[PDB]
Amino acid sequence: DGRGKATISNDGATILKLLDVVHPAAKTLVDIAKSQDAEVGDGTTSVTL
Amino acid sequence: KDQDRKSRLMGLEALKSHIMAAKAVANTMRTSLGPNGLDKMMVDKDGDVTVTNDGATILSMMDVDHQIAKLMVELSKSQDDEIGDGTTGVVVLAGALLEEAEQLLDRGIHPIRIADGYEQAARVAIEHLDKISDSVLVDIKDTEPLIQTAKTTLGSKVVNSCHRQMAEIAVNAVLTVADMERRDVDFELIKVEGKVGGRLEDTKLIKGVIVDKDFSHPQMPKKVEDAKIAILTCPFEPPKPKTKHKLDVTSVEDYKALQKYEKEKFEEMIQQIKETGANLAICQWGFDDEANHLLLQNNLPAVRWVGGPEIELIAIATGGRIVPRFSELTAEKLGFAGLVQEISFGTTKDKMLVIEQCKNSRAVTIFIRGGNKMIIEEAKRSLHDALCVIRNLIRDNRVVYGGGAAEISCALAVSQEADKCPTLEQYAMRAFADALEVIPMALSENSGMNPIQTMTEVRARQVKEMNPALGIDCLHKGTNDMKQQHVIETLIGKKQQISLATQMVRMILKIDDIRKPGES
Amino acid sequence: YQDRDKPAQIRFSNISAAKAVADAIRTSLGPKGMDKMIQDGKGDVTITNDGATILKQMQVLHPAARMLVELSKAQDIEAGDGTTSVVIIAGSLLDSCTKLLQKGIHPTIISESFQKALEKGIEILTDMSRPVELSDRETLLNSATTSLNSKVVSQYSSLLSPMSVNAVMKVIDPATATSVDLRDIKIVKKLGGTIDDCELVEGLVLTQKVSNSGITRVEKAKIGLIYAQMDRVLREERAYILNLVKQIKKTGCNVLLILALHFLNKMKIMVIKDIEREDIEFICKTIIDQFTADMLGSAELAEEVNLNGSGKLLKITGCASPGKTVTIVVRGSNKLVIEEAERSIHDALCVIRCLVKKRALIAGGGAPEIELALRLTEYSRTLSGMESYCVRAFADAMEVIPSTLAENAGLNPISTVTELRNRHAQGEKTAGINVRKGGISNILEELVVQPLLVSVSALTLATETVRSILKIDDVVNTR
Amino acid sequence: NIFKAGADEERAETARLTSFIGAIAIGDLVKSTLGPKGMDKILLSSGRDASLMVTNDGATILKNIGVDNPAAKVLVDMSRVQDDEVGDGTTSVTVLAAELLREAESLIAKKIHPQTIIAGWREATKAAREALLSSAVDHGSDEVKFRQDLMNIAGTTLSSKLLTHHKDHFTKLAVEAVLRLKGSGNLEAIHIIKKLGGSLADSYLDEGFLLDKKIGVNQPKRIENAKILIANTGMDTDKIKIFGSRVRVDSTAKVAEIEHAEKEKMKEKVERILKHGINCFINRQLIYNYPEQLFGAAGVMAIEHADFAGVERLALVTGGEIASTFDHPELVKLGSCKLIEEVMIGEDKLIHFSGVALGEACTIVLRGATQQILDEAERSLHDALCVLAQTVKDSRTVYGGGCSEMLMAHAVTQLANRTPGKEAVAMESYAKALRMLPTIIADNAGYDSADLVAQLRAAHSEGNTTAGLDMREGTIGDMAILGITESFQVKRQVLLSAAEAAEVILRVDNIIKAAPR
Amino acid sequence: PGKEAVAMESYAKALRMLPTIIADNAGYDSADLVAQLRAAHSEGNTTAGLDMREGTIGDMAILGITESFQVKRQVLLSAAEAAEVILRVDNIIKAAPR
Amino acid sequence: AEKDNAEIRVHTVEDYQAIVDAEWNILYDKLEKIHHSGAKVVSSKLPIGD
């Protein structure tokens, strides 16, 4: 991030939160991953891929 | 946000770029490995200049922006709690594993599959170290062989002149604070100080806490045999604030009035010392000329202007407590010690306070004398790894002969175990063998000899001449077989060099991308 | 050869920068020298032929060339004459060293060789000089008058010459003391009157007025150098002022060298204030808690004489103190009249000062330089080693002075110095260039002479500067 | 992106060149000043034209110049220690250490490892040091021969200085000052006086420890059995070294109260001074006239305006004590002086002692036209007193002028005959650097270096251990007959310091410069 | 004397270049072998030489390696006279080709 | 501590004994309020002095 600290993990939910892509169609798939956490809580990498 | 100007590195070129950034650190420290390793010039941000070959000190002073290069620095904090000597050897070994991994990426082998090969070959090398290891102090605790081992470690530093005397001090210091049977030695209980002047042969072992402060008055008693210690945050006198008193005296009427009130406070607190039975009074501030005048008549020595962190170190070592005010004084809060003396240095006015227990204790402090501050600073690091060598021998007395004999003997077993793995990880086991050969190879290169002719010559000796491992002489001694040269490193250190180097290579290979935004 | 490292590049940079200064001032040498036009940065344009003035306006940034500027200043302090000649001689020496360094001769050999030629050069000019008597005031009058004729004012030189002679002979024992202090003679110039009126005062004469103090006369003076509450403060300010006066009154000091105007009048103390430090040094040699009587001077009668053309002056005579000092009062119509009158006195005092230290007279018009170059050539034949070519280069560099005077006189520079060399071979130093008649003539009959100290100090000071420049290996910029 | 934004690190190839080029540039700068014929140099600060000056001193050049290279900074620090401790050989250390690094750079191009070069110089250093010990000749007896050696060493130290012309008269001043000492080499006992007026040949000398300072206004010119007591405090007025404290004055009577309070405070101070029973008093601060009259009424000589160097020197010469606190009487040691007389030298009042305890001290009075001449006269004289005091402690002397430098180079060459393979080439370059010192001396004198230096090799090859260079006649002759010699401790110090300085540069293969603040 | 001393050292240095090049073409270390021979022939042991077979220094009389005297005397003289002509010529005058 | 301190400037010498005690009184009060409720286990996020 802008602070200089590095985040290391394979979690798909955490990576998508840090990207924050400005493309409008890209924000749609990001929002679907957030709804995946409330209903289930995992599989965000599978749904996006 | 801030997607534009965001530095991104991905793909197969990302791994080759991370290895290149890691080899830049390994190629820098490989010249300083060994006792003959060349030094490094350090220019501080404030303009200071220091010269040291210590690997742990270099990594702390290196400022690297690259992320993978920062991971190599964080490894030093983990190893210094164990070895503190061959820390450079781990960075060199980590750079050799990544350098040989570059040849495997061209063949199309997946990075995770390469990391599995190193982990599989690491356990074979660690297992081989247990067979060839020999003991020393097994079943019998003796200080005679323990002192000779520490004499070799100090030979690589600038203290190599006085190296023989400083070995007996580190032995008696660790055995005092903890028992070898306990196998628990804390570094927080051991302190190291020093001051310019004198020589390194004047190093002494004082059991207790020592800080440099003078007495409240020079005529105070210099020797207190009984143990009474009053540690307070306030001096003995009418109460004064922490900054400025600023007494208001309008005329002589207020002078004679307040002086009588002060005179009552003069004899009250000084005679209060004998009420609690205390002898030595440790106060954070100093005393007036009248306060020291009453101490000379009652024979009550004291220390003035004690520092903030010094108060906590004295109460812990002497077994006392911090007393905020004289109203809470009691017999339980008094500190103990065997002797209290004031030892000056030459003509210097320092006169460091000396607190001696006259017996064993749980904390000791080693003091070093020398003609240069940089030499004393390097003498402090000279004892740092020396304590780790003694501590490792207390935990496990099994040792493996160093000087490159350990790394070469392991690659012979790993290369044979490679043909027993019908799988793509076989290549990683072969590359792991050539990587272990780099550490003993850098020793001969720093000695001004042909690296390759020295390496292959030792291989033939261990296979043919004798089964025990033979080392390489970097000091230009008589011959090989460092067992006669008494160059020996602990077995715990050998297991950590392979384990920590495997962790770093495994983490670097599994990271395929580095992201970070730029200035917008 | 190779010569990878070239320290001689700075040597050539020092010679080029030093020669550029000597080449400029060369055309201004001699009474017939061409005038030069100097334009100030503000746009002001001036024209002067004086070499000492132009060198100060050049603004020389080069370190080695500044040494020649300081060399001209050291020449005016000692001899006071020949400022332009020194810069030209020092410029021709460094130019001759260029041909020597190309031959591979080491500077220390060149530097030590000029010293032997300098010691021999002094003996040559001394043996050919004319010994004169210092006690004789007829020679001092003629030597100063003919010298000031080549200066700006040639008409009034007959008046100002005996004023300077009688001043020096009063403050200096004739034919006894070899040292003369020019600061012991003060010259005061004022507007009004004429140069025909001059007064030599044995005491001191200043420019200050005693206003507003009305005492104006002190005989036998010891001179020394140093609403109710609102009204009460005015009484206390008078107490502090009078307090410091009481301590002065106890010592007996009647004249002080600097509401209090009235307190000094009650004590009959003459007020002398607003005095320059350089003017104090003239009074220093002539005559509050640390103020005592031992540091006080002495005087006979002090007073302020106000004349028509001399303005307001303080006339103090009969100092009665160990020393010898005089004072000259100068009058004139305008400021330029008294300016050149005083400047002619400084030139007169310097020539007399040169005659006191060294008693001798030599001919002018390039005569000392040709005779010097003639004998050093024969002296170079007896020497052996590298000193043979070094002395010849030192001798041939003396030809620039006569060739310059012949060029400003309209004659042929090459043919003039050639004919004169053979005249000095058969004859004596009397031969030379006469700029008044525009041709070769005997300088002895022309009554053109200069004191020996001018030529000796010209060779001594210039040689030490040339040797100092050659010994410089390089320059280092510190911070 | 390893080191950016002010952080620079030169690699093994570049930090190699940078280390030597920075160090060699320092040695090549001051090499022109070696020898009595050495060149001058101009020092001018950037932005200020008042720093112009010309000096041939190698120590002064290195102090004023700045050094941005950490490799060259070590060489500069080793030169200042040479000037501050021994005082002689500042240029010799810098030049010799630079020649070792210049030859070591050519050996690295041959792929000779730096650690091997270091192993060669250590063995050659011991062989070169034993050569001076075998050629060192001292004198136990024959003080005439011992005094003559002091004049040759003093005349050698004063060479290539401002006093080199008049040094013939100065050799008698420096030697006599050290000859009268006859004891510990403490230099505080020999005072130095700088007075304006007169030429350099007018410098006088006093063996009674003459003081450079004048005391009081009216003081007694003679005193019998004067007890010396030093004190440190303001003797003038109130508010000494006190800033921020004011006094409310409403009228003139308040000022008179301060004058009475001042005389009251001074009276109490004079009483405590007189309780010591002393005939003389010394203080650093100036003494006011009122306590001066209180000292003169009791016979106590009032000494004022003392400096930091005075209290240290007046204590050992007179056998006294610093005694900063005169409050408690008779707890301090008092000095011993037979007579204190007033001597006027240079139109100034000076203080002359007599018969002091350990009266082997003395004082040299310099005479010059300006202060810049006197300052350079003291620096050239003080450097001479350092080596002469060292000569008293160790009387061994060796012959200079290329004699000792060439002899050490011959012993290293013979050592190259018995040696392993790689150490042979390393010690040869060490011997070549020792021959560079007599070579540079001949270059600054204009003489042919290749002719004179090469004949010294054939001279010291078979016998003739005393041969050397003669700058006067430009030939080779006996150094013992010509009277050119230097102390033994100077050669051993320059030889070891130059070897230790060049050893540190080789041990550094990389230079890490952090980001400047 | 002085000026002839430097010229002889360069002549002796060229003779040491012959065994140096022989060691370089054999892949060995010329710095060690040539330096040991100079130290060997410095005091005694006039028969020491290089052994290309074993890669070390040994006696030439025992190993049976020798060369004719007329050959070495001719190589020594023909090399000195050839370098003397080239060194003496400071200028080359070329004409027009025919 | 960086958070809770006591700074009072008075010209009275006798008040200095109370101010030093008042700074310890605030700390003693915070320790007494815990004892007033009878809490045996004290878990603090910020450090606790000796």
mmCIF file of C-alpha atoms in Angstrom, chain B residues 33 75 79 83 85-91 93-94 97 126 129 406-407 436 439 489-503:
data_model
loop_
_atom_site.group_PDB
_atom_site.id
_atom_site.type_symbol
_atom_site.label_atom_id
_atom_site.label_comp_id
_atom_site.label_asym_id
_atom_site.label_seq_id
_atom_site.Cartn_x
_atom_site.Cartn_y
_atom_site.Cartn_z
ATOM 1 C CA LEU B 33 32.891 -14.532 4.768
ATOM 2 C CA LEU B 75 16.390 -13.032 8.476
ATOM 3 C CA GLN B 79 19.586 -15.944 13.363
ATOM 4 C CA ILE B 83 24.458 -18.114 15.926
ATOM 5 C CA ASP B 85 28.617 -15.510 13.614
ATOM 6 C CA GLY B 86 27.920 -17.392 10.384
ATOM 7 C CA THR B 87 24.940 -15.186 9.547
ATOM 8 C CA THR B 88 26.828 -14.256 6.369
ATOM 9 C CA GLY B 89 27.065 -17.953 5.498
ATOM 10 C CA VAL B 90 23.276 -18.206 5.381
ATOM 11 C CA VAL B 91 22.920 -15.264 2.988
ATOM 12 C CA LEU B 93 23.882 -20.174 0.919
ATOM 13 C CA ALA B 94 20.536 -18.525 0.151
ATOM 14 C CA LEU B 97 20.228 -21.928 -3.979
ATOM 15 C CA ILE B 126 20.524 -32.356 8.503
ATOM 16 C CA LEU B 129 25.173 -33.858 10.348
ATOM 17 C CA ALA B 406 30.637 -29.820 7.108
ATOM 18 C CA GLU B 407 29.230 -28.392 3.869
ATOM 19 C CA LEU B 436 26.486 -26.255 -0.341
ATOM 20 C CA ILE B 439 30.436 -21.609 1.352
ATOM 21 C CA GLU B 489 31.295 -24.862 15.154
ATOM 22 C CA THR B 490 28.283 -26.107 17.097
ATOM 23 C CA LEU B 491 25.803 -28.583 15.633
ATOM 24 C CA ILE B 492 22.798 -26.376 16.430
ATOM 25 C CA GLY B 493 24.310 -23.662 14.245
ATOM 26 C CA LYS B 494 24.756 -26.081 11.348
ATOM 27 C CA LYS B 495 21.101 -27.133 11.501
ATOM 28 C CA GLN B 496 19.924 -23.512 11.529
ATOM 29 C CA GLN B 497 22.030 -22.507 8.511
ATOM 30 C CA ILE B 498 20.268 -25.104 6.363
ATOM 31 C CA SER B 499 16.824 -24.532 7.895
ATOM 32 C CA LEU B 500 16.795 -20.731 7.660
ATOM 33 C CA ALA B 501 18.230 -20.741 4.131
ATOM 34 C CA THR B 502 15.500 -23.155 3.032
ATOM 35 C CA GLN B 503 12.792 -20.870 4.438
#
